[PDB]
Amino acid sequence: GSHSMRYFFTSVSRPGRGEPRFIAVGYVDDTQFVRFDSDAASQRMEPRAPWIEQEGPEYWDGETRKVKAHSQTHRVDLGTLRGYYNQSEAGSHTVQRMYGCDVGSDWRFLRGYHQYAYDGKDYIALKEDLRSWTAADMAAQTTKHKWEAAHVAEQLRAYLEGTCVEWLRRYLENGKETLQRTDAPKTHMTHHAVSDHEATLRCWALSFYPAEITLTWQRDGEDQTQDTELVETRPAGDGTFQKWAAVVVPSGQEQRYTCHVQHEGLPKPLTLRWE
């Protein structure tokens, strides 16, 4: 189906001593493929997926140079933003940035994004037109005028629509054995009595990829949300994801209840009933 490349950057100031903690991660779809951590020893961009390891020295040198540049820009911004908000030098603050591009099934550019936050709140973001800026407050408005004057959106648009998608396509090809493979959820139902006349049915979806999934309960063929619990989709730790949905039912009435599973790796949705 469709695909994305995304990078995430976090800088956290350290008022007591030294420079901010800086962590950057890159993803293709739901697969992390690179990382940089200012606390780590290498001080280089590092691979985190097999299909990126084939990239040569020129690649790693450039990604390292670029990611360090991001870190220094963030470091300066922490100082600037402290000033904009008239904040003390005593507190720790955070800058977050994320950017990426999406492509469709034909691998053609679909959309781009580039957004920036201070202390966990929207600060400034590129609009979907890749031309305009959303500034959340008057400090961000100051930044917006600066970025207009510096032709920032133009450069970002060029990257997002061109370079970003070109390299995404490259990665999709090189890592095709996993990146272009869907892993359908392995599903089963468990049963846990909660009294001598009621029980929890838990519908499990395991080892799936990508993370996107829908789990729903029906009772007698109609959606049921009352007396249900749905946990947030969670990483298994091996590149796949997990989720479950549960419903409390009167014991003996389990057969009324069906769990429905929708996932990209399933040609048709699955239906489960307590066995």
Partner: peptide
Amino acid sequence: YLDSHSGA
């Protein structure tokens, strides 16, 4: 492949 800056 990272983007190749303007400060806040």
